[PDB]
Give the backbone structure.
Amino acid sequence: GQKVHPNGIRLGIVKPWNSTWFANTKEFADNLDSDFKVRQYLTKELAKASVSRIVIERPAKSIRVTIHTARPGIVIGKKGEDVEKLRKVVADIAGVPAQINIAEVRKPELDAKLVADSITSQLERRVMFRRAMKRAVQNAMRLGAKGIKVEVSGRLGGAEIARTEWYREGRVPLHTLRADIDYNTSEAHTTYGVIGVKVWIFKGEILGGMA
Amino acid sequence: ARYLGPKLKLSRREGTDLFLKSGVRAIDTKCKIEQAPGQHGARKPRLSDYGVQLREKQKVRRIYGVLERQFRNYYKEAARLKGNTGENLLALLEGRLDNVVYRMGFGATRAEARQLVSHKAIMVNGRVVNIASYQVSPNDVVSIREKAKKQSRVKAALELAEQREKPTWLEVDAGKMEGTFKRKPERSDLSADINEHLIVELYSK
Amino acid sequence: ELQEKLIAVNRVSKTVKGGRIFSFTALTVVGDGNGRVGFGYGKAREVPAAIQKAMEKARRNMINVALNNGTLQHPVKGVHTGSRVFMQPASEGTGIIAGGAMRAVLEVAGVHNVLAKAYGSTNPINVVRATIDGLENMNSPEMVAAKRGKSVEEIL
Amino acid sequence: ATVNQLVRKPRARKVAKSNVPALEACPQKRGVCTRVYTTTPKKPNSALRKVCRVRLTNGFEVTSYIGGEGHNLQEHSVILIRGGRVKDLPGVRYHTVRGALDCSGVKDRKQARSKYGVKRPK
RNA sequence: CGCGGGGUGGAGCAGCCUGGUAGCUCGUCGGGCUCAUAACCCGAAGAUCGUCGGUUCAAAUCCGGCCCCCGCAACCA
RNA sequence: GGCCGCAAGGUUAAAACUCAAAUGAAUUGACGGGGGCCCGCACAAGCGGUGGAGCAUGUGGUUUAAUUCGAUGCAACGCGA
RNA sequence: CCCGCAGAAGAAGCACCGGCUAACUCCGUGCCAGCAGCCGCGGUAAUACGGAGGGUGCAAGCGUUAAUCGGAAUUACUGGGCGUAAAGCGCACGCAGGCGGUUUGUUAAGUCAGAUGUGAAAUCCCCGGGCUCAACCUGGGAACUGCAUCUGAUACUGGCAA
Ligand SMILES: [Mg+2]
Ligand SMILES: [Mg+2]
Ligand SMILES: [Mg+2]
Ligand SMILES: [Mg+2]
Ligand SMILES: [Mg+2]
Ligand SMILES: [Mg+2]
Ligand SMILES: [Mg+2]
Ligand SMILES: [Mg+2]
Ligand SMILES: [Mg+2]
Ligand SMILES: [Mg+2]
Ligand SMILES: [Mg+2]
Ligand SMILES: [Mg+2]
Ligand SMILES: [Mg+2]
Ligand SMILES: [Mg+2]
Ligand SMILES: [Mg+2]
Ligand SMILES: [Mg+2]
Ligand SMILES: [Mg+2]
Ligand SMILES: [Mg+2]
Ligand SMILES: [Mg+2]
Ligand SMILES: [Mg+2]
Ligand SMILES: [Mg+2]
Ligand SMILES: [Mg+2]
Ligand SMILES: [Mg+2]
Ligand SMILES: [Mg+2]
Ligand SMILES: [Mg+2]
Ligand SMILES: [Mg+2]
Ligand SMILES: [Mg+2]
Ligand SMILES: [Mg+2]
């Protein structure tokens, strides 16, 4: 069958929104276009900075970006040079005065987006897909994830026939709404085509809800 | 007959040091001793039972400079002879005259020793012997004849032999340039890394 | 201390409603050289898991064999499903002359000189089991003297 | 099985016939190409395999495969044949010897030259 | 920087050579034991094998890089 | 070929040629106009329809300079749109 | 056979590299050309067809074919089987033949032990010797598993007697 998006089905219940601002129908679409532009530019720039989650937050006359990243040192660089460059570019893109904040992810082995990006990086660098996915699963379980599942799909090892391979350890209850399933995907553009990577990480269950 | 190709190639393929060069310089400095020779040298394929047996036999043959027919004859004689077959085979290979000359130290390499023996530089009991495969007997004196006593390569080889570890089963006088073959080298005197079971099994298929 | 070697890996199928499900079987033999030898057979969806399971099973369920100076004590026969096996105490220096699975089992067991031949079926699993059984059914001069109520000098 | 039964009637060795009876225990034999043509191979494979019907010096008329790319053979061409069948050709149990009497070596071969009668290039 | 050796639960030690198997003692907790401590017995917890990689069906082990630690290294007026 | 038989035939008993399998037991599925058990608007019990008419709409076909391309058992045909 | 002369000077090839089986990549071709001992390979990324580079194995040889034994316990004496895989006559009676409960005596045929004669030399094997070594030649032994005759043993088998 076809499974629902774990993040989308858990929005509001346990997962927050990435963009968090109010807008009337007059400015809704323009806000969406600008947010798309900002996220695209930021990912393209900080591809090698291990960025996990861009969070856009708009005061009525301001744009506040919050970059969740594993290595703040590289994104900020020398004192404030790189952040100021990013701030000025995002300001011109948005057309509004901008303010960039940086949140450090202390455990990049439990972040699904970072894990998927690392696997795709390894796949592009022509490692063995089983080796890469087993390393990711072992690292997450060692770091203490309640569960993790990783799936790779399409022309594995340059094979003419496409296949899907997946490894799960621990438990990853998808149907439990109150669970905390971090999920993200990535694509490795190998010389034989695209290889899709999906990662589920069950970190726990939030009883209190806490939206 | 004699292998005339690159010698470090054989050493790399086998993996160990076969002492195919004089030993003034490290074999790691002279070549990539770790990597196998060829386009696909970096890859290390897994060897099967027949592979390792063949490898061991090739190692011994390349070390001593013996082709398949002569080596097979050596094995046949060793099997026929009483006692341990592998030990007898090693004893015969040691008994070879070129090996004896190299052990005494009148040659930087076994090839150099064979060169001297072929070019009639070696007297055994006052008899000029020309065959490298000549089996030396116990209590045999082996001496360099006066024609070759002037060669500088013999003295350089003597210095290299002094550098090397001395064999107990021989007694060599460098001033006289002559050594006595006291006794057949025991298995304890011979190198431990060489395995004989593989050779015996390979030829006892 | 325990020397171990993998004899054979075989691919097998299950043929389920959807398609065919493949899995791997590993036959391994471990031994201490000093006389203890034990075989193991494992199965998993992947080769490394199967080999590790076989290694664990082989590490367990060992058996001691009475070795005389690194060789057998008397000619011994061994039988199983198809494998009929004969082994002879050859002289020192002959080496282990045996075919495949028997070679592996005897080498890890620690016997350095035997003359063996496998009659009948030569299926690796059955021949390993038959060889181990034959090694088990081999008594020493001390054992026969004790059971017969005599001294070793009377038995010779 | 019983030794008494064996004494009455011993065990009679199973005489295995040769698979190349036209050679008559000879390594090669000379013949004349009665006809040169091509044939379709057996089921799992496909090609136009070159074969010769050859009248041997000892009266036998056999069919022989022509190995290598291209051949100059024709009718009334004396050739030398050896043993060996082509499997996926019904009734062909002999090979022609390339580089033999009135048979040219394969052109432009650099490997297996000895098998195809090709002389060493300079 | 030159050469060599080393890095394994918190500490002190095996396991490295032969690629498959994380062990021993002290320390911690609990129980029994002791009136209790102590001693003794039984359990339970604790490394990811310095780290980054490479090889391989599979790496504490094989190879390389980096990080450190130690020994050796010729220089202080 | 021999022997036996009125005959039908019986008995003794090859070779050339041809293939790389033929077979025995058992294992997991799928299937059976095999067997048992169970469920679902599956049937049965009911109500309202479609198939007839006109028109709307999609498809096939035919036509056209073009009638853009795709979906086309259930699970395409008021589908992408 | 020895001594002298000159100068690396005159002297390396063949098969193979998918598994069995030690040794891999690229290019050309596209169920064609072709390969093949078996299993198979080739329909557009061929480690299996051709060429190249690299490698592996032998080497003045290397491959192919033919032939015998081996592996083949696949004619099984050593050393197999016959309920369903090939294999118990449809069933019985019975001659020749094969086998023979138990005790004693006797014989000495089988059996065993010893001795004698012979079993040509060469070949095979062991210890030596001579060709510079080896092949080769050679001294002495061992062996030639056998046959015959004689002298003994009498447990078993056979004969004879009860
Ligand atoms: Mg859905
Ligand atoms: Mg069989
Ligand atoms: Mg008839
Ligand atoms: Mg309903
Ligand atoms: Mg109805
Ligand atoms: Mg209608
Ligand atoms: Mg239609
Ligand atoms: Mg259409
Ligand atoms: Mg269409
Ligand atoms: Mg519809
Ligand atoms: Mg190979
Ligand atoms: Mg070929
Ligand atoms: Mg190609
Ligand atoms: Mg080719
Ligand atoms: Mg043949
Ligand atoms: Mg036979
Ligand atoms: Mg049978
Ligand atoms: Mg039947
Ligand atoms: Mg039957
Ligand atoms: Mg019956
Ligand atoms: Mg009787
Ligand atoms: Mg009778
Ligand atoms: Mg008598
Ligand atoms: Mg004679
Ligand atoms: Mg001599
Ligand atoms: Mg003689
Ligand atoms: Mg009697
Ligand atoms: Mg009697």
Remarks:
- Strands of chain B lie at 122-124, 127-128, 140-144, 170-173, 178-181.
- Residues 105 and 162 of chain B are 8 Å apart (CA to CA).
- Chain B touches chain C at residues 49, 83-87, 197, 200-201, 204 (CB under 8 Å).
- Residues 34, 42-44, 46 of chain B lie near RNA strand E (CB under 10 Å from a C1').
